[PDB]
């Protein structure tokens, strides 16, 4: 666009979005076996 | 990047890296104190 190509920007954004779900997944199951959940 | 502006990509990426660390910090302190804190 002005300096760096959108190529690196996109790949970086998408990936960062994926890891957020991964790191969150660990917490979900972790707490799932600690404090019971109410349905 | 053939539709939406490149701006949203950059902001989303940088923001994703910031929150990623925060997600990890919550687990660290959570396990550091084990039991929740009240009052």
Swiss-Prot record, chains A, B:
Site feature: Breakpoint for translocation to form TRIP11-PDGFRB: 3-4
Q: Where is this site: Breakpoint for insertion to form PDE4DIP-PDGFRB fusion protein?
A: 3-4
Positions of modified residues (Phosphotyrosine):
38
Transmembrane ranges, per UniProt, are 9-29
Q: Where in the cell is it found?
A: Cell membrane; Cytoplasmic vesicle; Lysosome lumen
Where does the record place the site Breakpoint for translocation to form the CEP85L-PDGFRB fusion protein?
A: 34-35
What does the entry's PTM section describe? Autophosphorylated on tyrosine residues upon ligand binding. Autophosphorylation occurs in trans, i.e. one subunit of the dimeric receptor phosphorylates tyrosine residues on the other subunit. N-glycosylated.
Question: Its biological function?
Answer: Tyrosine-protein kinase that acts as a cell-surface receptor for homodimeric PDGFB and PDGFD and for heterodimers formed by PDGFA and PDGFB, and plays an essential role in the regulation of embryonic development, cell proliferation, survival, differentiation, chemotaxis and migration. Plays an essential role in blood vessel development by promoting proliferation, migration and recruitment of pericytes and smooth muscle cells to endothelial cells. Plays a role in the migration of vascular smooth muscle cells and the formation of neointima at vascular injury sites.
Implicated in which disease? Answer: A chromosomal aberration involving PDGFRB is found in a form of chronic myelomonocytic leukemia (CMML). Translocation t(5;12)(q33;p13) with EVT6/TEL. It is characterized by abnormal clonal myeloid proliferation and by progression to acute myelogenous leukemia (AML). Myeloproliferative disorder chronic with eosinophilia: A hematologic disorder characterized by malignant eosinophils proliferation.
Q: How does it assemble?
A: Interacts with homodimeric PDGFB and PDGFD, and with heterodimers formed by PDGFA and PDGFB. May also interact with homodimeric PDGFC. Monomer in the absence of bound ligand. Interaction with homodimeric PDGFB, heterodimers formed by PDGFA and PDGFB or homodimeric PDGFD, leads to receptor dimerization, where both PDGFRA homodimers and heterodimers with PDGFRB are observed. Interacts with SH2B2/APS. Interacts directly (tyrosine phosphorylated) with SHB. Interacts (tyrosine phosphorylated) with PIK3R1 and RASA1. Interacts (tyrosine phosphorylated) with CBL.
By sequence similarity, the record places it as follows:
Belongs to the protein kinase superfamily. Tyr protein kinase family. CSF-1/PDGF receptor subfamily.
Q: What is this protein called?
A: Platelet-derived growth factor receptor beta
Q: Which lineage is the organism of this entry classified under, starting from the top rank?
A: Eukaryota, Metazoa, Chordata, Craniata, Vertebrata
Gene that codes for this? PDGFRB
Full-length numbering of the shown residues: 526 to 563 of 1106
């Amino acid at each position: 666009g002005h300096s760096l190509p959108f190529k690196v920007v996109v790949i970086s954004a998408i990936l960062a979005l994926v890891v957020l779900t991964i790191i969150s997944l660990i917490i979900l199951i972790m707490l799932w076996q600690k404090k019971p959940r109410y349905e």
